[PDB]
Design a protein around this ligand. Structure first.
Ligand SMILES: *[C@@H]1O[C@H](CO)[C@@H](O[C@@H]2O[C@H](CO)[C@@H](O)[C@H](O)[C@H]2NC(C)=O)[C@H](O)[C@H]1NC(C)=O
Ligand SMILES: *[C@@H]1O[C@H](CO)[C@@H](O[C@@H]2O[C@H](CO)[C@@H](O)[C@H](O)[C@H]2NC(C)=O)[C@H](O)[C@H]1NC(C)=O
Ligand SMILES: *[C@@H]1O[C@H](CO)[C@@H](O[C@@H]2O[C@H](CO)[C@@H](O)[C@H](O)[C@H]2NC(C)=O)[C@H](O)[C@H]1NC(C)=O
Ligand SMILES: *[C@@H]1O[C@H](CO)[C@@H](O[C@@H]2O[C@H](CO)[C@@H](O)[C@H](O)[C@H]2NC(C)=O)[C@H](O)[C@H]1NC(C)=O
Ligand SMILES: CC(=O)N[C@@H]1[C@@H](O)[C@H](O)[C@@H](CO)O[C@H]1O
Lengths: 191, 593
């Protein structure tokens, strides 16, 4: 139920990646849908390579999935000055293990001990069984691939684009359009 | 079952790369800014790292290693499941720790006194090694040499006699028959189909290459003896072994410092570019960008940025307490940095390539597991730095980088003056580098018994090295223990292996580049396929064996000494021309006493 100038994000050079997978971005001023949903979080740079349609590995299998058929894009930027810390930052979490690789947009915000092979376990989580939640450790002096990046996902009727207007010429023969209508003539001020 | 080991080692690798970072970063901060708070910090960080590694290792010991199919997780389990210590009884463990600190403190703190004035004494490196590197007074060299052995080496004899026992109990309790077989175990390869390599196989293969080197060393020994008779007249025979106190340091480890006594044609200026560096007013920043240019030129990626801010390349305008010893640091988390404090000298211009050549390998295997981010053997890890320093030292590189004039001429006599300085350094150490490990391997197994330890040493000095005791010795001495690698408990054999791999790497990349002349002239500046052949070994870490990685660099599945020999054929041709009138090799019966 609002206008959405994607053209600002597309033009702004602050982003380390701005990449589209169900749409080509300049058309977003014309393309429209019922909703758009924004997902937002912080990740290691080399692992941002796992955030696309149909990919595999630690994020792609065990955080959240974009489908191969993802109707949308993906943006990301440097966050070193904010999200890394001198003593390290550990506020960010990830669950490393889970039986069955996740489904499209699926969320497993639950945790129990993962466990492997034929063996019973009740907490403890040293041998054969491990607690799958872990923290990150973002530190400013990391290599560029281990530094923190802010990431936003967009999955793409009410959310239209900025349908901009021309200047208006009066008392001249003109090929006009107003709202969802068209016409040609001389536009004179009426009473 | 393998998923238990896999997801154990996934948790281990995700934890270890953080705990090692906060440990090694505190270690970095201490070495670059020394304070007691930084010491107490980096020690309690190292405590928490070590406590994690051992507390995980007791779990790594429960996984059955024969139930593992994939090589790269078997290699990671075996590297975490190792026991090493704790095999010993707790009192024998503390006793071994006490002995290692005792041999370390005796070597590092040991004083040698002057018999003419006992109020003056010398530590090892300041003054006492300065005599051995730069004095020509035979009687002062002999005093420093025998007083080190009798005043400090004799203290280490009765400690080395107990260290060998406790290390052998540790090795046996790890199921290795002796502690030398434990050390050889680095090079061991199994289950990779034909690429396999036995712990024992190094023992014969090192001797099978060393018996190709001997003719080059026998003409170098004859040449150096014929020279040293002019430096030390009446003391040296034209056919004898060389007296050990005359060999350029406290042990005779390298002949490199004999050059002023042994030089071919010293009227030709042995080439330097320190003048060109100060005339172009180069600083550390320029030196290191002119170093980086070689790597991006051959076909490698430029530095991880934060390298430049977080590295220390020079001394701080503050009167800082820091170690200026040039060191390449990997901290984990992709954090690469050098700690040094450079001065405008061509030695540091080459050392910028030497240390950056460590970082460029540490970057290529950064995709590997933490347990596997190491050289394919302990010879690879230094040889891969030196093949950069070799190329940067060439006159073709030095004119192309703007460090020599376009009208300057190189000549044969400049080649021979350089190559002999290389030979005294590179080749002359190899009899000792083989002999010290042969003696120690035969001591750990008891092939040399505790009533013939020193008797067999001086037989091997005379037979293998052509070097003779300045004065007779007995089993109250330990002349091996008079050295750092024997007193501070370090395996020495890596230096023999690195001295083959260095030239095997170089000549393969020089053939890949199609170099037109002698191997010591080879430059890989503005190549590309030399960087491609280098890279395919660089990105494996430990995950593939050195016997597989060598055939991608060199084209050989094993070590070969040929390439080192080739590097010296121009000099050997001349050494065979200089000593036609002389006796060559040595008598083991002859002695200076
Ligand atoms: C076990 O070995 C296999 C191959 O021997 C490895 O399989 C590769 O795994 C990566 C992802 O980690 C894939 O991109 C490759 O396509 C796989 N290769 C093949 C031919 O299947 C596997 O990674 C090894 N196990 C572990 C834990 O590393
Ligand atoms: C490591 O040392 C231990 C002795 O402390 C060796 O014996 C193991 O003992 C533990 C109990 O403390 C058992 O759980 C293991 O099963 C024993 N060894 C095994 C796995 O057979 C053990 O053999 C040593 N491990 C190595 C590397 O050989
Ligand atoms: C360096 O090259 C010169 C030039 O060939 C060598 O001088 C020759 O030496 C041989 C052997 O004594 C003589 O037969 C020639 O007549 C010499 N040529 C000239 C032009 O003088 C010189 O020996 C070489 N030096 C070394 C160390 O190899
Ligand atoms: C190897 O690379 C260097 C550096 O890129 C080359 O140096 C350039 O040489 C040209 C021709 O003389 C000059 O116009 C440039 O100014 C030089 N570059 C710099 C940064 O000074 C060198 O010529 C190359 N050599 C070979 C044989 O490929
Ligand atoms: C592959 C690559 O981009 N290499 C870059 C090079 O383009 C750049 O000119 C140089 C400047 O420092 O740094 C490096």
């Amino acid at each position: 139920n609002c206008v959405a100038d994607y053209s600002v994000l597309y033009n702004s050079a602050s982003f380390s990646t701005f990449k589209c997978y169900g749409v080509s971005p300049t058309k977003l001023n014309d393309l429209c849908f019922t909703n758009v949903y924004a997902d937002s979080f912080v990740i290691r740079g080399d692992e941002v390579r796992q955030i696309a349609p149909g990919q595999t590995g630690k994020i792609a299998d065990y955080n959240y999935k974009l489908p191969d058929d993802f109707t949308g894009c993906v943006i990301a930027w440097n966050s070193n000055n904010l999200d890394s810390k001198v003593g390290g930052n550990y506020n960010y979490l990830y669950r490393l293990f889970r039986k069955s690789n996740l489904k499209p947009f699926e969320r497993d915000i639950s945790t129990e001990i993962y466990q492997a092979g034929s063996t019973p376990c009740n907490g403890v989580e040293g041998f054969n069984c491990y607690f799958p939640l872990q923290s990150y450790g973002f530190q400013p002096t990391n290599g560029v691939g281990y530094q923190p990046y802010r990431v936003v996902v967009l999955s793409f009727a009410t959310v239209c684009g900025p349908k901009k207007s021309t200047n208006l010429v009066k008392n001249k023969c003109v090929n006009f359009n107003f709202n969802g209508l068209t016409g040609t003539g001389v536009l004179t001020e009426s009473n | 079952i393998e998923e238990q080991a896999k997801t154990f080692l996934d948790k281990f690798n995700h934890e270890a790369e953080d705990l090692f970072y906060q440990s090694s970063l505190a270690s970095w901060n201490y070495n670059t800014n020394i304070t007691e708070e930084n010491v107490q910090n980096m020690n309690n960080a190292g405590d928490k790292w070590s406590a994690f590694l051992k507390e995980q290792s007791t779990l790594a010991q429960m996984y059955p290693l024969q139930e593992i199919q994939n090589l790269t997780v078997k290699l990671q389990l075996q590297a975490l499941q190792q026991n090493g210590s704790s095999v010993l009884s707790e009192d024998k463990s503390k006793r071994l720790n006490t002995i290692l600190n005792t041999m370390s403190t005796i070597y590092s703190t040991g004083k040698v006194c002057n018999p003419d004035n006992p109020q003056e004494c010398l530590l090892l490196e300041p003054g006492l090694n300065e005599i051995m590197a730069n004095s020509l007074d035979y009687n002062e060299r002999l005093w420093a040499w025998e007083s080190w052995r009798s005043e400090v080496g004799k203290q280490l004899r009765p400690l080395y006699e107990e260290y060998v026992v406790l290390k052998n109990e540790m090795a046996r309790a790890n199921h290795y028959e002796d502690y030398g077989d434990y050390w050889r175990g680095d090079y061991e390869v199994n289950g990779v189909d034909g690429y396999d390599y036995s712990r024992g196989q190094l023992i014969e293969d090192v001797e099978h290459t060393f018996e190709e080197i001997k003719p080059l060393y026998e003409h170098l020994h004859a040449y150096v003896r014929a020279k040293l008779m002019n430096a030390y007249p009446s003391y040296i025979s034209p056919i004898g072994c060389l007296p050990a106190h005359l060999l350029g340091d406290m042990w005779g480890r390298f002949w490199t410092n004999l050059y002023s006594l042994t030089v071919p044609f010293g009227q030709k200026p042995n080439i330097d570019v320190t003048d060109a560096m100060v005339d172009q007013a180069w600083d550390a920043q320029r030196i290191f960008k002119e170093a980086e240019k070689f790597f991006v030129s051959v076909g490698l990626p430029n530095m991880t940025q934060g390298f430049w801010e977080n590295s220390m390349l020079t001394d701080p305008g503050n009167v800082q307490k820091a170690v200026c010893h040039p060191t390449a640091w990997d901290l984990g988390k992709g954090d690469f940095r050098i700690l040094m404090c450079t001065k405008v000298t061509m030695d540091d211009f080459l050392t910028a390539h030497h240390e950056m050549g460590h970082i460029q390998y540490d970057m290529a295997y950064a995709a590997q597991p933490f347990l596997l981010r190491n050289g394919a053997n302990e010879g690879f890890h230094e040889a891969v730095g030196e093949i950069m320093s070799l190329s940067a030292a060439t006159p073709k590189h030095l004119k192309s980088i703007g460090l020599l004039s376009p009208d300057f001429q190189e000549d044969n006599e400049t080649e021979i003056n350089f190559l002999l300085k290389q030979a005294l350094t590179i080749v002359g150490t190899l009899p000792f580098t083989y002999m010290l490990e042969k003696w120690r391997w035969m001591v750990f197994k008891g092939e040399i018994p505790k009533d013939q330890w020193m008797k067999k040493w001086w037989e091997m000095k005379r037979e293998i090295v052509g070097v003779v005791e300045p004065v007779p010795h007995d089993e109250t001495y330990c002349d091996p223990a008079s050295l750092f690698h024997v007193s501070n408990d370090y395996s020495f054999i890596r230096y023999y292996t690195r001295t083959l791999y260095q030239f095997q790497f170089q000549e393969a990349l020089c053939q890949a580049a199609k170099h037109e002349g002698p191997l010591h002239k080879c430059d890989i500046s503005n190549s590309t396929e030399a960087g491609q052949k280098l890279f395919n070994m660089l990105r494996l870490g430990k995950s593939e064996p050195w016997t597989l990685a060598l055939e991608n660099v060199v084209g050989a599945k094993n070590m070969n000494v040929r390439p080192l020999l080739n590097y010296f054929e121009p000099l050997f041709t001349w050494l065979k021309d200089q000593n036609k009138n002389s006796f060559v090799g040595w008598s083991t019966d002859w002695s200076p006493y």
